[PDB]
Amino acid sequence: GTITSQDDNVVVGYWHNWCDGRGYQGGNAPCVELKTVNPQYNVVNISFMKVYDIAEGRIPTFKLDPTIALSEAEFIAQIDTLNSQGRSVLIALGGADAHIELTRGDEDALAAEIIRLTDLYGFDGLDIDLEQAAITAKDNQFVIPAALKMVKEHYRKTGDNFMITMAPEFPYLTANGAYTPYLTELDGYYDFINPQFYNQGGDGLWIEGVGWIAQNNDALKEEFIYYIADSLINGTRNYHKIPHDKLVFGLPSNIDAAATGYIQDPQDLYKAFDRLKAQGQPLRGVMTWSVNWDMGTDAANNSYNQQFIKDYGNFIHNQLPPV
Numbered sequence: 156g157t158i159t160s161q162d163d164n165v166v167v168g169y170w171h172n173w174c175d176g177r178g179y180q181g182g183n184a185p186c187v188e189l190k191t192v193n194p195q196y197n198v199v200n201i202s203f204m205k206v207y208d209i210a211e212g213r214i215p216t217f218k219l220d221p222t223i224a225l226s227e228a229e230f231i232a233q234i235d236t237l238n239s240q241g242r243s244v245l246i247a248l249g250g251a252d253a254h255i256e257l258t259r260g261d262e263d264a265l266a267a268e269i270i271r272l273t274d275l276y277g278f279d280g281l282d283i284d285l286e287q288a289a290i291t292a293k294d295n296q297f298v299i300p301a302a303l304k305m306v307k308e309h310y311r312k313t314g315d316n317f318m319i320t321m322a323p324e325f326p327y328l329t330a331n332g333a334y335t336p337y338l339t340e341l342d343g344y345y346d347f348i349n350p351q352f353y354n355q356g357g358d359g360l361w362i363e364g365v366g367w368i369a370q371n372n373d374a375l376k377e378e379f380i381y382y383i384a385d386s387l388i389n390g391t392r393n394y395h396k397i398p399h400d401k402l403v404f405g406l407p408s409n410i411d412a413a414a415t416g417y418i419q420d421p422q423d424l425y426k427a428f429d430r431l432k433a434q435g436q437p438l439r440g441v442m443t444w445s446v447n448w449d450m451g452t453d454a455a456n457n458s459y460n461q462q463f464i465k466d467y468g469n470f471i472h473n474q475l476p477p478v
């Protein structure tokens with residue numbers, strides 16, 4: 156269809172193209188139809204575009220998992236509903252064991268497949284979410300940016316903003332870290348970055364007056380959020396700069412969705428976000444792995460009962476728009 160783009164604040168949630176994933180604390184994440192996803196997720200990321208079978212070759216694609224029991228046509232129409240509600244639906248390129256190892260030249264074909272998928276299913280953009288091994292694999296750092304420049308240009312002809320987002324793990328965002336080529340090559344092209352502030356154990360940063368602030372330290376959660384974001388939006392403390400109106404804070408829905416990084420007390424985030432707002436640099440929103448985890452069960456089959464979006468949806472949607 157057309158591109159449904161986002162000009163305001165966002166709550167981003169990832170969508171599993173599989174059923175009954177097992178959690179880090181023994182819980183379960185079911186497959187769900189798009190239509191069931193909470194409306195306050197105004198960007199939903201279909202996970203994942205990848206290589207399904209090497210017989211098909213090196214270029215990744217998307218195949219709707221049949222175990223979900225949703226026809227390709229129904230799926231397409233659910234996308235159309237989300238668009239009529241003004242919500243976006245992106246394709247997330249990558250994930251674990253995606254086998255994305257592209258060679259120079261591949262960008263033509265990759266641009267072409269992204270466009271095809273976009274016209275077929277009515278996606279509005281694409282999220283780069285490479286696994287660790289894919290970040291610096293073969294020519295990925297050249298090919299993927301180059302393809303997406305061509306996709307962005309294609310949709311400009313007809314006045315559309317094909318969204319481009321990224322979900323780097325945060326330690327790769329140091330100055331001249333492994334993700335810097337993706338950022339630099341696509342500066343001017345990307346809508347916003349939603350880094351993963353989870354699954355990195357005791358990585359973090361040092362702050363004079365406070366000390367060592369780790370991503371897995373609940374006692375210091377308020378400071379972690381504030382200082383890491385402050386560092387990114389200002390380009391200080393040896394972090395590569397991401398403007399504040401283009402930074403989205405990525406988090407786990409609950410303790411089953413990631414091993415570390417879950418926020419026990421939402422007030423830590425609320426406060427940090429107000430320090431950032433009051434210094435004249437409000438963030439663009441939050442992100443979560445994942446909607447399926449927000450709608451899932453712990454290891455005794457109690458429902459997580461949409462706790463993440465309960466904690467953050469109104470907070471974020473009732474903030475003033477970005478400039």
Ligand SMILES: [Ca+2]
Nearest residue numbers: 369370372379
């Ligand atoms: Ca922390």
Ligand code: NA
Nearest residue numbers: 156157277278
């Ligand atoms: Na669309």
